[PDB]
């Protein structure tokens, strides 16, 4: 006879359980990364803002020099 049957040793394994691998970093790591990014941004902003203030002072004194003729 010929029918639809499983083999002698059966079929392979079949999963039925929830699989969540829990990928990622701990909270301390991401918080430290954020704090370091904030500090780097603050330092770069302080340097560029001081330079921009000096440039603005230079332009203002240029206007001071040009004022009496106008």
């Amino acid at each position: 006879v010929k029918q639809d049957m499983p083999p002698v040793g059966g079929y392979g394994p079949i999963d039925y359980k929830r699989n969540l691998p829990r990928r990622g970093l701990s909270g301390y790591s991401m918080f430290a990364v954020g704090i370091g990014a904030l500090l780097f941004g603050y330092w770069s902003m302080m340097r560029w803002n001081r330079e921009r203030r000096r440039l603005q002072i230079e332009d203002f004194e240029a206007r001071i020099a040009l004022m009496p003729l106008l």
Partner: protein
Amino acid sequence: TYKYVNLREPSMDMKSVTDRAAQTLLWTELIRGLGMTLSYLFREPATINYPFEKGPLSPRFRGEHALR
């Protein structure tokens, strides 16, 4: 013969509380969902090109009637 779905008690220690607070303030599982959509973006779509690519059938299929 039964299992207690959704009865797990959350932890209390400082490292796990800090992890949960970091997930709250930085939205980790939303990034997980974004990553799953990004994974599904790079797969082969299962769309066949009808009418040039008919779907698979069986010899037992029931359709239009005929007289032999």
